[PDB]
């Protein structure tokens, strides 16, 4: 399988703000290329039955090349009742290459504050960290990380 992983950190100050601010990178750790069009990422969290809204503020690969959708889970899980799924229109990663930064913001329809501490894919961190809690897929097959249970 493709060997890719996600580096992430929450945007500073975002935790109890009115925005979820995932900062992500996807790196190809393997010895094969990766076609990003086949790759999706899922950021799992509790939207708590509030309508969700997406912005891409900047991506090294170009925000216009990033796709998104929100998916409500059948029923809530620990740490998640929704995921944001990211996809890509194009782009490849050679072995060792990274997407570079993908800087996103999510907000509730009513711009109310989130309380993100319990969100499966959320954590505060001083720097980008590898995380197993943002999952990656190759044509929909899980290839990085662990989904909430």
């Amino acid at each position: 399988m493709a060997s890719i992983s996600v580096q992430y950190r929450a945007g500073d100050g975002s935790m109890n703000s009115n925005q979820i601010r995932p900062q992500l990178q996807i790196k190809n750790n393997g010895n094969t290329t990766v076609d990003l069009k086949d790759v999706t990422a899922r950021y799992w969290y509790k939207a708590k039955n509030k309508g969700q809204n997406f912005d891409c503020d900047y991506a090294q690969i170009g925000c216009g090349n990033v796709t998104h959708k929100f998916v409500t889970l059948h029923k809530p899980k620990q740490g998640a009742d929704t995921y944001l799924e990211l996809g890509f229109k194009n782009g490849t990663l050679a072995p060792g290459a990274s997407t570079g930064n993908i800087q996103l913001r999510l907000h509730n329809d009513d711009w109310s504050n989130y309380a993100q501490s319990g969100d499966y894919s959320f954590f505060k961190s001083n720097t980008f960290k590898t995380t197993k809690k943002i999952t990656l897929y190759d044509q929909g097959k899980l290839i990085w990380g662990t989904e909430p249970n």
Side-chain angles (χ1 to χ4, degrees):
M1 68 169 207
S3 184
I4 49 179
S5 65
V6 49
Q7 296 68 58
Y8 152 91
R9 63 178 302 268
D12 305 74
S14 64
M15 176 190 307
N16 294 318
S17 82
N18 62 13
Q19 299 182 136
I20 299 173
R21 300 209 293 112
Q23 321 285 299
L24 322 180
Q25 308 163 353
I26 296 165
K27 185 170 181 190
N28 181 2
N29 303 308
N31 66 357
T32 54
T33 70
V34 171
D35 294 331
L36 291 174
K37 200 179 162 293
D38 288 334
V39 172
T40 46
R42 296 183 196 158
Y43 178 98
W44 306 78
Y45 67 109
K46 299 189 267 183
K48 298 161 179 175
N49 287 86
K50 291 182 181 174
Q52 298 299 294
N53 302 268
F54 170 97
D55 286 281
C56 181
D57 292 328
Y58 168 75
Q60 186 189 289
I61 65 169
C63 283
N65 288 317
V66 179
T67 69
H68 82 281
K69 63 178 183 175
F70 297 99
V71 182
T72 306
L73 305 187
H74 195 174
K75 60 178 180 300
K77 294 176 158 41
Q78 188 67 35
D81 59 40
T82 302
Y83 57 79
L84 168 71
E85 181 169 285
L86 299 178
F88 303 93
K89 296 187 188 168
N90 51 55
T92 61
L93 301 175
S98 169
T99 56
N101 293 345
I102 307 170
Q103 309 192 173
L104 307 175
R105 283 179 303 118
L106 319 178
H107 68 272
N108 297 306
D109 285 351
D110 68 351
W111 280 102
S112 58
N113 294 347
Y114 297 91
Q116 296 172 58
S117 296
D119 286 337
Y120 185 78
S121 297
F122 173 79
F123 58 72
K124 176 157 63 68
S125 160
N126 55 353
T127 60
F128 281 89
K129 308 294 187 186
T130 295
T131 174
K132 66 174 186 48
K133 291 184 184 277
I134 297 174
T135 48
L136 301 170
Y137 305 78
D138 182 3
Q139 301 191 47
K141 306 199 196 67
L142 179 68
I143 60 165
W144 166 267
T146 299
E147 300 182 350
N149 55 358

